[PDB]
Design a protein around this ligand. Structure first.
Ligand SMILES: *[C@@H]1O[C@H](CO)[C@@H](O[C@@H]2O[C@H](CO)[C@@H](O)[C@H](O)[C@H]2NC(C)=O)[C@H](O)[C@H]1NC(C)=O
Ligand SMILES: *[C@@H]1O[C@H](CO)[C@@H](O[C@@H]2O[C@H](CO)[C@@H](O)[C@H](O)[C@H]2NC(C)=O)[C@H](O)[C@H]1NC(C)=O
Ligand SMILES: *[C@@H]1O[C@H](CO)[C@@H](O[C@@H]2O[C@H](CO)[C@@H](O)[C@H](O)[C@H]2NC(C)=O)[C@H](O)[C@H]1NC(C)=O
Ligand code: NAG
Ligand code: NAG
Ligand code: NAG
Ligand code: NAG
Ligand code: NAG
Ligand code: NAG
Ligand code: NAG
Ligand code: NAG
Ligand code: NAG
Lengths: 224, 346, 370, 49, 197
């Protein structure tokens, strides 16, 4: 893989709770991605295991849908239960079954162990930037997602797009390492780490978070 | 480092004097707060809000609610007294004659305009537009809040939580009638309407009286009447232009509005605090817990909300005392500046 | 009665306010039909050890919490955040039942904010815990002559335990400088030690079976709700309402709030519920408190007369819940008992917005407003 | 102390409105001095004689 | 060795802000006012400064109080001697008696003792087992220590609210006095007053 560092540009804001508020400025304190943070752009062409530190913000502008899932865990072997999310052309499947994958896990397009959880749903993935936030809180693997019509693939847009929670999985496993999945018969994705931050969220009349202020970014935002 | 002012050295000597050879007429503006918003608080609905258990636990805390209501009622009466003693200083509602010739002086931007529904002058309309004053829920705030609007209002939240704004006794039309009567009496009689019955006198003669009052011979006015009238008209036009462009001159009245809005907003936001309880929702407490533990949590909430209400009442009492001092100053200025000519410097 | 006097001076006095009373009650719970399997939790042949405590997820069932007294012989039902009596009224999203067996000395360690060997290496409870702990003696089940070494607990660990975190690894704990490398000797301790349970020990060392029921106060749709039946939906009427254990009083109106599909409740500035989602039919209802307002009594002196007018402050005259035949609409409220006259006098008893009332002749004495 | 701070966060906005009142007092002190002394527009100085 | 109370006040979070105008600036304002009065009379307060001899200004003041000019112009030396003697008497009285500035000494002392009482109020227990938060936290566990910390928090918050309320009332009194002083500067200094006493 090839690593290039870049800026967040006020990305990664999500809905902190399932409560409707409209035309109000609400102060929340949670694991957020700080504004103008240092995110890493990975280029993988046909792969060390990445850390999972206080949640991961993941982003991809790949229209080819080569990226098709995630693997989470501690050691990613048969000894430790490893979560696996796989998105094929019909559904999405989430399983805690460990496959005992190799050091470079991938999927073959051209035509196990202990199993305690399984969840099947509709495809997460349909010039379109897809954003996800994964965080483990109190034995919950909370996932937030968003889709955005992007203009430039290389350029992370300057704007706001609140992430909405997809699922609330009570997996309750110890996660410190993770990796992505590629489909083989090229890929480029952005990874960032969340931190405990206090945010000021602005709701419009429709209850949508249209703006946010990071209180600890600089003295001006602290004054705000 | 801040600059105190330009340096000056008066050319003083024991056989030299400086005497002016010309003059100018200045029209300055002084803004004084008189009365603030009259408010009333339903302590039972604020603290408990339709909860019999909370009300019965509140009954054991004595006469705190009654004395808070008494203090707020005293403030509300004091505001009307301030407005009455400031504006209602003329016994008869004078009106100006249909003719509008006062020796070249205009008095067109301060005399009322009958075309508008409220008989307020141009400058009064400019002031009312420049002060961003809320309606304060006068005309049926609950009926307005009953309309299903997707955006909840802060006034609606205050009304639902039990903080009500009472309307003033004297309407703005009545205040404008007082000011119009005072203006007409001043223009048509001078100071004589402040010490008995109004005595008519031409405005040139009245200004000659004023000139003799400030120690200047009246022939100065009778020989510079046109220049003085032009200077007065230009100063009035400059007042109009300053009011129609800069909106920061009314900061005192804007602060009077803002403080009374912010106090109610803080009092409403203080209902979401826990004060060491398990929840800030009384019905949630009563549904989760049994009698004794619910009583303990409700007592914690009651103590917190009672302390918040007492803080609000104390702050309003101090603010009302300050406003009363300002209103007394405004009444004295109406008695001496308007009803007569003042020899007091500055 | 308000003035604590038998003589009332002339003026206007603020008397106690008025409320529009609710008509009936509405109960609205989700449509579920199953029963929660507490038999598998309580009537079990063997509970797992504390270091490997069993966890069961309970969802999509009707929970009857007064039935649990028959299954196990315990004295009380200790709960943090809730009360055992009210458990059948409010209902939760998910329930989690944890089961293990400990000693009698370590029962007090199963509580929020508690530290110790068990609470630090085997089972740690969150400090914001909202649930119940059940513990009962099992000396006739978990004790055998010569020792019941089938129960284990952890004595050694490098770090503590996060809330609701389970450790299963059996590795050689190194208490010294030299590495152990799979050899238990000298300062190389096996962390798992066995409870030696004998029937001849005292009651303080006897085994105790513990079941912890943790409730979830989430904002997701509730799946575990009690046996309380649900009634029909009444709108545009001042009623009491009970939505998924959320009790209140007001008027439910059809709303146009654009709720996102994951949002259930809506909140106000004072953190009170403003819009709810009906669990049976997924529609959004606004909640508005029933009509109220201030009440003032306008009277002359009792030395003169006993006739009284009443000003309803903040109420439109068409919205009065109900009283003389003279009803007048003022900008301060609705005045009942004073007939408005077209004349104008000095202000005798002020009301607001230029209105004053007085006890005056008519022909013959009555209260007039002007 | 972090525990005391977390317990104090439950008491609302008393802890900030006292600060607001003290700031108002501190501003009006300088306002009082400014009104009392700074009434003249220019800094006059006396002749050397 | 002599432990200051101000260090305890600072260490407990009670600081004092400096004034906006320095004493040099206050003295410059007073010098400007005094020089303008001496060299121009009330004319500098009515508009631009108009120079006039001091004897003629005294004659204007005498006509203001109702005494003709010849009284001054024939008793000028006597009046100057009396003014100089009065100034010397004021200087001697201020050098001798140290209790003249009682109002300003009280202004200092009220704030000093208010801060001292606020600092000393930290030693009270308010019903808790100890007045030391670290001692409470080291002795009791979380659940049993939260109650004592709540007691201490409530007591200290009540004390701080009492301090703020008393300071607000004192500030209102000081503002009334400052308005009176501004009026006295406008009328007595920048002109001649006909108001009795
Ligand atoms: C006193 O000042 C006024 C200005 O306020 C002078 O009036 C101006 O005179 C000049 C020259 O005669 C004209 O061009 C201006 O149009 C006048 N202005 C106004 C507003 O009328 C007046 O001349 C001055 N008096 C003396 C004696 O110089
Ligand atoms: C008094 O002032 C008013 C307003 O400036 C004058 O009325 C205006 O006069 C001008 C011409 O002088 C007209 O073009 C405007 O249409 C008038 N109305 C307004 C609203 O500007 C009035 O003439 C002045 N009267 C005197 C005696 O000076
Ligand atoms: C008016 O009083 C002043 C003092 O207040 C008198 O001046 C004093 O006169 C005596 C005798 O001539 C001198 O010894 C003093 O030194 C003077 N005092 C001062 C301060 O100069 C003055 O004589 C009195 N005038 C009349 C007419 O009695
Ligand atoms: C992110 O960190 C790397 C670490 O070397 C640095 O090179 C890069 O400039 C950083 N990105 C920024 C500052 O935007
Ligand atoms: C996607 O995977 C699911 C997993 O069971 C399977 O049922 C489904 O048929 C798959 N869809 C495809 C391969 O298009
Ligand atoms: C699956 O679970 C069984 C039951 O404990 C266990 O014996 C087996 O080793 C597990 N297989 C794995 C972890 O691959
Ligand atoms: C809410 O959305 C509608 C249509 O989606 C839009 O017309 C309206 O302006 C929005 N409200 C805002 C932005 O406050
Ligand atoms: C008057 O002033 C002049 C110069 O300003 C000076 O020389 C003269 O001494 C002064 N008169 C007296 C009596 O000192
Ligand atoms: C519960 O009743 C509602 C109302 O008729 C209905 O829409 C829903 O399908 C019912 N649920 C079940 C599981 O039958
Ligand atoms: C517990 O429930 C089971 C049902 O399988 C029953 O057989 C048993 O008698 C009950 N009581 C005990 C003490 O096991
Ligand atoms: C869980 O992960 C954390 C990560 O720091 C580690 O400290 C802890 O020992 C792990 N616990 C278990 C039981 O694996
Ligand atoms: C009172 O209700 C009537 C009828 O609904 C309405 O027309 C009126 O505007 C309301 N308010 C007042 C002050 O009459």
């Amino acid at each position: 893989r090839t690593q290039s560092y870049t800026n967040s540009f006020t990305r990664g804001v999500y809905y902190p709770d399932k409560v409707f508020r409209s035309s109000v400025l609400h102060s929340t304190q949670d694991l957020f991605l700080p504004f103008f943070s240092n995110v890493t752009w990975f280029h993988a062409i046909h792969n060390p295991v990445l850390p999972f530190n206080d949640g991961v913000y993941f982003a991809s502008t790949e229209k080819s849908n080569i990226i098709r899932g995630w693997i989470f865990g501690t050691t990613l072997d048969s000894k430790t239960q490893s979560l696996l999310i796989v998105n094929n052309a019909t559904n999405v499947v989430i399983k805690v079954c460990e496959f005992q994958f190799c050091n470079d896990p991938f999927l073959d397009v051209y035509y196990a162990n202990n199993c305690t959880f399984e969840y099947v749903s509709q495809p997460f993935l349909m010039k379109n930037l897809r954003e996800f936030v994964f965080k483990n809180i109190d034995g919950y693997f909370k996932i937030y997602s968003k889709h955005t019509p992007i203009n430039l693939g290389r350029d992370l847009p300057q704007g706001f797009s609140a992430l909405e929670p997809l699922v609330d999985l009570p997996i309750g496993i110890n996660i410190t390492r993770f990796q992505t999945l590629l489909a083989l018969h090229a890929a480029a994705y952005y990874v960032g780490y969340l931190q405990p931050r206090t945010f000021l969220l602005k709701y419009n009349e429709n209850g949508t978070i249209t703006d946010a202020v990071d209180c600890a970014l600089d003295p001006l935002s602290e004054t705000k | 480092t801040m600059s105190l002012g330009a340096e000056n050295s008066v050319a003083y000597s024991n056989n030299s004097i400086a005497i002016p050879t010309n003059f100018t007429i200045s029209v300055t503006t002084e803004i004084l707060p008189v009365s603030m918003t009259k408010t009333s608080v339903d302590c039972t609905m604020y603290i408990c809000g339709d909860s019999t258990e909370c009300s019965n636990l509140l009954l054991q805390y004595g006469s705190f609610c009654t004395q808070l209501k008494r203090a707020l009622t005293g403030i509300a009466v004091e505001q009307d007294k301030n407005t009455q003693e400031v504006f209602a200083q003329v016994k008869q509602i004078y009106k100006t004659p249909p003719i509008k010739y006062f020796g070249g002086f205009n008095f067109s931007q301060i005399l009322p305009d009958p075309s508008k529904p409220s008989k307020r002058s141009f400058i009064e309309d400019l002031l009312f537009n420049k002060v961003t004053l809320a309606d304060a829920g006068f005309i049926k705030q609950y009926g307005d809040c009953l309309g299903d609007i997707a955006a909840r209002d802060l006034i609606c939240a205050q009304k639902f939580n039990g903080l009500t704004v009472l309307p003033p006794l004297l309407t703005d039309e009545m205040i404008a009638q007082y000011t119009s009567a005072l203006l007409a009496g001043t223009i048509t009689s001078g100071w004589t309407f402040g010490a008995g019955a109004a005595l008519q006198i031409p405005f040139a003669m009245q200004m000659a009286y004023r000139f003799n009052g400030i120690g200047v011979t009246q022939n100065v006015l009778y020989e510079n009447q046109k220049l003085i009238a032009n200077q007065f008209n230009s100063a009035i036009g400059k007042i109009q232009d300053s009011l129609s462009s800069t909106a920061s001159a009314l900061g005192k009245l804007q602060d009077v509005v803002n403080h009374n809005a912010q106090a109610l907003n803080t009092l409403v936001k203080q209902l979401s605090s826990k004060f060491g309880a398990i929840s800030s929702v009384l019905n949630d407490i009563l549904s989760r817990l049994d009698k004794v533990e619910a009583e303990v949590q409700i007592d914690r909430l009651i103590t917190g909300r009672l302390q918040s209400l007492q803080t609000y009442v104390t702050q309003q009492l101090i603010r009302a005392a300050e406003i009363r001092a300002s209103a007394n100053l405004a009444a004295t200025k109406m008695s001496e500046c308007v009803l007569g000519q003042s020899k007091r410097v500055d | 009665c308000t003035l604590k006097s038998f003589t009332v001076e002339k003026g206007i006095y603020q008397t106690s306010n008025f409320r529009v009373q609710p008509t009936e009650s509405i109960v609205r719970f989700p449509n579920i039909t199953n029963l929660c399997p507490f038999d598998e939790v309580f009537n079990a042949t063997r509970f797992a050890s504390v270091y490997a405590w069993n966890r069961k997820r309970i969802s999509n069932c009707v929970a009857d919490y007064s039935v649990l007294y028959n299954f196990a012989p315990f004295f009380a039902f200790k709960c943090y955040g809730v009360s055992p009596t009210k458990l059948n009224d409010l209902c939760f999203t998910n329930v989690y039942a944890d089961s293990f067996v400990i000693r009698g000395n370590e029962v007090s360690q199963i509580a929020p904010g508690q530290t110790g060997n068990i609470a630090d290496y085997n089972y740690k409870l969150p400090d914001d815990f909202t649930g119940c702990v059940i513990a009962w003696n099992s000396n006739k089940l978990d004790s055998k002559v010569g020792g019941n070494y089938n129960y284990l607990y952890r004595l050694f660990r490098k770090s503590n335990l996060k809330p609701f975190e389970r450790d299963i690894s059996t590795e050689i704990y190194q208490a010294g400088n030299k590495p152990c490398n799979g050899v238990a000797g000298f300062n190389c301790y096996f962390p798992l030690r066995s409870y030696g349970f004998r029937p001849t020990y005292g009651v303080g060392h006897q085994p105790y079976r513990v079941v912890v029921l943790s409730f979830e106060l989430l904002h997701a749709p509730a799946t575990v709700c009690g046996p309380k039946k649900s009634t029909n939906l009444v709108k545009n009427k001042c009623v009491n309402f009970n939505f998924n254990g959320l009790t209140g009083t007001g008027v439910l109106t059809e709303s146009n709030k654009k709720f996102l599909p994951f949002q259930q409740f809506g909140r106000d500035i004072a953190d009170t519920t403003d819009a709810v989602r009906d669990p049976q039919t997924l529609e959004i209802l606004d909640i508005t408190p029933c009509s109220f307002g201030g009440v003032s009594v306008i009277t002359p002196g009792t030395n003169t007369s006993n006739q009284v007018a009443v000003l309803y402050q903040g109420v439109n005259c068409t919205e009065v819940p109900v009283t003389g035949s003279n009803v007048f609409q003022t900008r301060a409220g609705c005045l009942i008992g004073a007939e408005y006259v077209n004349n104008s006098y000095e202000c005798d008893i002020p009301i607001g917005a230029g209105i004053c009332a007085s006890y005056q002749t008519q022909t013959s004495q009555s209260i007039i407003a002007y």
